[PDB]
């Protein structure tokens, strides 16, 4: 559906196509061939410094999915309840009305407190319960 080709469309239609937004995110139309006899020019330095910032934005979120059991797929749920105090709108309502665009501007605040809680109930509690529950 195109790179960010679902950003305009509502959350429901945005969750419908979000693989392309991660597909062309790394090696798409920016990777290229990457081809006086020296490569220490202004274009050589700029491409390698940008390469470091390229992986940094991917790995930051990649590590999080890995410590949530959501690493194996694009969309995976967790065993974390939603504290009503964060957002008071209906599940189905933001999906055809608010859109991911405004929605990120709503969570961004408690987003770090959400990430903190996501680590324990789904991994620090769920995967730590396995140690005893695996053999019975």
């Amino acid at each position: 559906l195109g790179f960010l080709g679902a950003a305009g469309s509502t959350m429901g239609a945005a969750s419908m196509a979000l693989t392309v937004q991660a597909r062309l995110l790394l090696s798409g139309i920016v990777q290229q061939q990457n081809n006086h006899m020296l490569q220490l020019t202004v274009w050589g330095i700029k491409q390698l410094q940008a390469r470091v910032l390229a992986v940094e934005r991917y790995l930051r979120d990649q590590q999080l999915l890995g410590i949530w059991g959501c690493s194996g797929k694009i969309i995976c749920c967790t065993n974390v309840p939603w504290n009503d105090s964060w957002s008071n709108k209906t599940i189905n309502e933001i999906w055809d009305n608010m859109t991911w665009m405004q929605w990120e501007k709503e969570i961004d605040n408690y987003t770090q407190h959400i990430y903190t809680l996501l680590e324990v109930s789904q991994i620090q509690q769920e995967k730590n319960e396995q140690e005893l529950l695996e053999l019975d």
Partner: nanobody
Framework: EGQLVQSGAELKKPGASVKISCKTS????????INWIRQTAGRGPEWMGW????????????????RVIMTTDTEVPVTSFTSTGAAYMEIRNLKFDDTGTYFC????????????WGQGTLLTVSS
């Protein structure tokens, strides 16, 4: 919660062409649909028609087809979400049964339905 500005106190004699306007403020006018309704003196509100400001789709009642023809303009963006637009309603060959209160309504997203209404335009179709 968004506020609507409904242009009022306009009325004329039967048979003549009536033009009713409404200014939209403090919301994304583009993806939000626009609904138009009227209520007679016999407490029976007749649903006039449904119009879309992003696409040319429309749904209108058979009693309001040849008589009623609606139009909409392009959105004027204020922020990355908020915009300003307007909708016009033209009615031809009016009767004393058409006399009543005419309202403009803001859309929802099961999306075709409204969410918020305007002040009200009391149309008096009298000679």
């Amino acid at each position: 919660e968004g506020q609507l500005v409904q242009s009022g106190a306009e009325l004329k004699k039967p048979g003549a062409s009536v033009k009713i306007s409404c200014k939209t403020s403090g919301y994304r006018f583009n993806f939000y649909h626009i609904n138009w309704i009227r209520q007679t003196a016999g407490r029976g509100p007749e649903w006039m028609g449904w119009i879309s400001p992003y696409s040319g789709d429309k749904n209108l009642a058979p009693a309001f087809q040849d008589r009623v023809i609606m139009t909409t303009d392009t959105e004027v963006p204020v922020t990355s979400f908020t915009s300003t637009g307007a909708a016009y309603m033209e009615i031809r060959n009016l009767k004393f049964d058409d006399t009543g209160t005419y309202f403009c309504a803001k859309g929802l997203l099961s999306t075709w339905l409204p969410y918020l209404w305007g002040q009200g335009t009391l149309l008096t179709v009298s000679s």
